[PDB]
Design a protein around this nucleic acid. Structure first.
Lengths: 97, 127, 149, 84, 210, 95, 76
RNA sequence: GAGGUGAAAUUCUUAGAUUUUCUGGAGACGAACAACUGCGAAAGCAUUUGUCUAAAAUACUUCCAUUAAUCAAGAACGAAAGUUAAGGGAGUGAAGACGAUCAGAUACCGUCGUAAUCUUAACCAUAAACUAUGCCGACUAGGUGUUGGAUGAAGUGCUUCCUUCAGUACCUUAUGAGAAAUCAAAGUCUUUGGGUUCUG
């Protein structure tokens, strides 16, 4: 029972706070600095992982590899592959610490 | 000056193997059993056969010079029976009355931790 | 018991006293304020009531406030669109389906999946018997993963 | 509607060849022709191209495998290798 | 036969008698060296008959020959196990039986696989027939016992290990630690086996024998 | 009829048991039915025991106490006089 | 005469008239001097208000409390 | 000379069988602990370890607010045996060969030995699948236990006793029953009706 915590936190944050996902959208968020933390899928191509992680460390933001693959669609509430998440406005959730 | 030798006594409801070996456990000294003693095709495990064979090996070992004997008791096998055969007690009695030095007696009859199927089917034997 | 055997008579019994406890002085206004804030902070209503009873000491909310917990949560529009029990049971359903796809040999898992999905259909029929659910719900086993929202 | 009861994909062979060799063959081509999930993209779009190569339409990144199964018990020794 | 010669045996220095018996070897004719056949055998002697004491009549140690000069051999520790009669006599119904084993590599690059047998305790005030413990309790017993044994079985050398098997300073501390969780009864080490040993070390073996 | 209340086996809240084999005949019997005797018989009879003891050494050597734990099927048990038919009114009494 | 029964405490829960075995307590921490309210047979951990310290170990029974303190049944 | 038997024979054995001991392989199984003990709806499930998954029991001043019971149709699992396809194939071992005993013996007994038994993927849906007692629900009588809890008290943070749950058996009693054997449920039935299905 390790990833159940992150699953629940993501479930709460989708209800509670503004969210953006998609490669171009997350790039824009990290460039403008609005992003607060990024969730990256495990099976995402290594180039995307490297570029997102480098941009995060340059822009002073968090980063978190998910426990599983790019089937975060079943967890995030959508119905399609997503493979990357940027949380622009954390709502009332315990994801920061 | 005291020297020890192993004596395997194998009693399996039949011929009582007497097998005196070097204390190490290889290159045995004298193997007599009970078969070549009784020619009646029966009573191999009878006390008479074991007693006389044991007294013969006692005389032979007196001649050789070894006196101290450890005892290793084996009975049939892990798949046929579990109790020592009738002739084992007679062999022990004969070795006691022989005059040979006796050491330690121990049981080495194999005990199967597994449950390998033994002879006769589910209905079992009929005698 | 619904399945297997065993009555399991263990449960919780509410006290004979139905008014507010005489020692209590806390006011409902702050009681509803605190419950709304916490249920927004994130917790399902059963444990919401549990933590209200434990950490906050407001026994018999139906007595200390003139309304029940689900109704005071829903009256502000924050109400979850699926009931607590059905949501939890569907989560269990998707969990053992995720396991059984990996392992097609677990026969007791198959048994309990059949049992739980029968319970799912029964409870869904009950909840749509009232006006407490969209009438178009069918719960196909395909979109069960994302149906939790 | 359902044009056939049980023959299914092997109806292309007509009445020739015995049932003990048609039911036997049907066991495998059903899961051969069906597309498979791709690890590299998560899109179930990997088909067959030859006797031993599977290709994802989305990835355009082909992977070797068995004759008709992308994975097989003889190929699930990766767990023993990877436990190290 | 009449072509064989006596061969006395020797044991490492720490023991009390260091000389228990005489083995037998065939003649010295070719093409055998009359030494390779002697080498690589196994032994069995009571620790009671090797230390002249009654208390230690329930354990036996195998000895494997490792070096030969002149007439007397040198042997080496090869295996420890328990006597079958006391092994059986310990086990009786009404108590659950606890078994444990693991593999530990020693400080001397030696691999020894060992077993322990444990029993429950009636104690005084239970006034009942059965004396069984919970499955989780037994699992904790097994985990704690393996963790305890591996420390003192790896941090020391094999000579110190085999000497510490003489006063049995393992079971006493096993009992002391398990006192705080669940009381036990007579607990011991059933069998020791040599999983693997490196090549011959003449210098170390001869210094340990002297 | 229902001659025996427990059905010749302690089977209760159980579905199946691992079956063992009879020592004598080899027939398969479930564990909770076969007669079991946990037996402690000496290696040799006392007559030879005496001579062994005073022909032994250390003056404290003790002869081993062997263990058996043997089992028997119903038919072999009743054949080898391991059990008695007893009487109906007494049949219920065990110990 | 089962109606005026008196010693039915020893009887199982949901006796003649159901009555919970639980109760509420007021705990005073020794040397910390603060007031708070606590529920016996709770199911979640609790910390004080004045100084954040560990109170209870939640178990299926009546909770473990702390080594010291003075708890009084707040029942009226 | 060895297996062998109530005997004997078949069989193996001067090319060293049976037997002691050491090393490597294989397959099987997990005894002794083990029980009128546990879990599983049922068939079943006893070495250790890790992962994943479920269920039940207690306690609750937590929620839901009638969401329940049994079921024609239907569905899921379903011992051994058997069949299909690969693997694997020790031991046992339907077939069969034999050697015996026998008035004869195709069998009981003895030697060998094929299908099989074991693993993966599917069928087959039958058993004395037996507490032969369908399931749910209230009541009537006590004791002895015993498995897992929970409460209070005491031999010394630990160990027993008091009480109470859920199982779970046993022993006695029935102005209860029945044809009896017997049964605390097969009882609360001519003073005949708690609900429900199936069957003769």
């Amino acid at each position: 029972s390790a990833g159940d915590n992150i699953n629940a936190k993501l479930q709460l944050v989708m209800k509670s706070g503004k969210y953006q996902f998609g490669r171009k959208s997350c790039l824009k968020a990290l460039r403008t600095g609005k992003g607060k933390l990024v969730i990256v899928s495990s099976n995402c191509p290594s180039i995307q992982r490297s570029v997102i992680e480098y941009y995060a460390m340059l822009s002073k933001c968090g980063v978190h590899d998910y426990h599983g693959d790019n089937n975060l669609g079943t967890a995030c509430g959508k119905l399609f592959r997503i493979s990357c998440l940027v949380i622009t406005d954390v709502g009332d959730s315990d994801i920061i610490k | 000056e005291l020297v020890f030798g192993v004596a395997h006594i194998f009693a399996s409801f039949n011929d009582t193997f007497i097998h005196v070996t070097d204390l190490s456990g290889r290159e045995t000294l004298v193997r007599i059993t009970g078969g070549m003693k009784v020619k009646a095709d029966r009573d191999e495990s009878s006390p008479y056969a074991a007693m006389m064979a044991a007294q013969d090996v006692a005389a032979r070992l007196k001649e050789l010079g070894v006196t101290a004997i450890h005892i290793k008791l084996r009975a049939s096998g892990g798949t046929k029976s579990k109790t020592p055969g009738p002739g084992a007690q007679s062999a022990l009695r004969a070795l006691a009355r022989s005059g040979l030095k006796i050491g330690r007696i121990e049981d080495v009859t194999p005990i199967p931790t597994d449950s390998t199927r033994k002879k006769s089917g589910r209905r079992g034997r009929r005698l | 018991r619904m399945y297997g055997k065993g009555k399991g008579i263990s449960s919780s019994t509410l006290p004979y006293k139905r008014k507010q406890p005489s020692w209590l002085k806390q006011k409902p206004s702050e009681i509803e304020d605190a419950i709304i804030k916490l249920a927004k902070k994130g917790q399902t209503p059963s444990q919401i009531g549990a933590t209200l009873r434990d950490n906050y000491g407001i026994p018999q909310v139906k007595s200390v406030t003139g309304n029940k917990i689900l109704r005071i949560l829903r009256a502000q529009g924050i109400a979850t669109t699926i009931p607590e029990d059905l949501y939890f049971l569907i989560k269990k359903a998707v969990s053992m389906r995720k396991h059984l796809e990996k392992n097609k040999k677990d026969k007791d898992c198959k048994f309990r999946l059949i049992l739980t999905e029968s319970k799912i259909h029964r409870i869904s029929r009950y909840y749509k018997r009232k006006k407490l659910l969209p009438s178009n719900w069918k719960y196909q086993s395909s979109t069960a993963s994302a149906l939790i929202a | 509607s359902r044009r056939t009861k049980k023959v299914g994909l092997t109806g292309k062979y007509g009445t020739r060849y015995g049932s003990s060799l048609r039911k036997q063959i049907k066991k495998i081509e059903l899961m051969q022709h069906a597309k498979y999930l791709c690890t590299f993209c998560g899109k179930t779009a990997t088909k067959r191209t030859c006797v031993g190569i599977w290709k994802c339409k989305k990835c355009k990144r082909k992977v070797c495998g068995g004759a008709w199964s992308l994975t097989t018990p003889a190929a699930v020794a990766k767990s023993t290798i990877i436990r190290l | 036969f009449t072509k064989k010669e006596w061969y006395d045996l020797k044991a490492p220095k720490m023991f009390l008698v260091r000389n228990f018996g005489k083995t037998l070897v065939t003649k010295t004719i070719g093409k055998k060296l009359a030494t390779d056949s002697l080498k690589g055998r196994i032994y069995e002697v009571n620790l009671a008959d090797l230390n002249n004491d009654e208390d230690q009549a329930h354990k036996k140690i195998k000895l494997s020959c490792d070096h030969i000069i002149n007439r007397d051999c040198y042997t080496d520790f090869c295996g420890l196990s328990i006597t079958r009669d006391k092994l059986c006599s310990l086990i009786r119904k009404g108590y659950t039986l606890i078994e444990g084993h693991t593999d530990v590599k020693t400080l001397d690059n030696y691999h020894l696989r060992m077993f322990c047998i444990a029993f429950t305790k009636k104690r005084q005030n239970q006034t009942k027939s059965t004396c069984y413990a919970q499955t989780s309790q037994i699992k904790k017993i097994r985990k704690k016992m393996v963790d305890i044994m591996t420390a003192e079985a790896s941090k020391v050398l094999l000579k110190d290990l085999v000497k510490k098997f003489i006063p049995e300073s393992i079971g006493k501390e096993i009992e002391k630690q398990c006192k705080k969780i669940y009381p036990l009864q007579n607990v011991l080490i059933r069998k020791v086996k040599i999983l693997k040993r490196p090549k011959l070390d003449i210098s170390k073996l001869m210094e340990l024998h002297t | 009829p229902k001659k025996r209340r427990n059905g010749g086996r302690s089977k209760h809240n159980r579905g199946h048991v691992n079956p063992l084999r009879c020592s004598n005949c080899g027939r398969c019997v479930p564990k909770d039915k076969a007669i079991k005797r946990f037996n402690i018989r000496n290696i040799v009879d006392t007559s030879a025991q005496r001579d062994i003891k005073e022909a032994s050494v250390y003056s404290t050597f003790q002869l081993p106490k062997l263990y058996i734990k043997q089992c028997y099927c119903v038919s072999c048990a009743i054949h080898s006089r391991f059990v008695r038919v007893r009487s109906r009114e007494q049949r219920r009494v065990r110990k | 005469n089962p109606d005026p029964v008196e010693e039915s405490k020893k009887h199982k829960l949901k006796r003649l008239i159901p009555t919970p075995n639980s109760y509420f307590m007021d705990v005073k921490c020794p040397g910390c001097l603060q007031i708070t309210t606590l529920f016996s047979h709770a199911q979640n951990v609790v910390l004080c208000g004045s100084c954040n310290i560990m109170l209870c170990q939640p178990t299926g029974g009546k909770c473990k409390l702390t080594e010291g303190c003075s708890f009084r049944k707040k029942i009226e």
